[PDB]
């Protein structure tokens, strides 16, 4: 809510090892979780998430006008996943796993 508009800090990564996220996503069997991280430049972001145990991230693009997460443009980084949070991202993912299998039952 308050913490998310423009400035954000809780799911996006931009300091710790980005590749280390894959080793942390494989330790969670049965569904993984949805996260994000920075790339090798301030002109492109990515989403690190996974299910089962086949870790896979994503690459969101951005232009000088609006951003393009995929089939929708949403210059807002939080609004981009805000509407897609309830809708389906890839052919099945849905950012519905904001935590690792441990106490979400």
């Amino acid at each position: 809510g308050s913490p998310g508009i423009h400035e954000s800090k809780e799911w996006y990564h931009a300091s710790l090892t980005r590749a280390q996220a894959e080793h942390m996503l494989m330790r969670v069997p049965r569904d993984g979780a949805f996260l994000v991280r920075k790339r090798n430049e301030p002109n492109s972001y990515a989403i690190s998430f996974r299910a089962e145990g086949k870790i896979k991230h994503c690459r969101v693009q951005q232009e000088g006008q609006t951003v393009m997460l995929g089939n929708s443009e949403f210059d807002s980084l939080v609004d981009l996943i805000s509407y897609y949070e309830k809708h389906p991202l890839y052919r099945k993912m849905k950012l519905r796993y904001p935590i690792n299998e441990e106490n979400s039952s």
Partner: peptide, 12 residues
Amino acid sequence: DNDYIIPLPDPK
């Protein structure tokens, strides 16, 4: 090409 995917709601 692994460790990356496109957020598209459909098989295409």
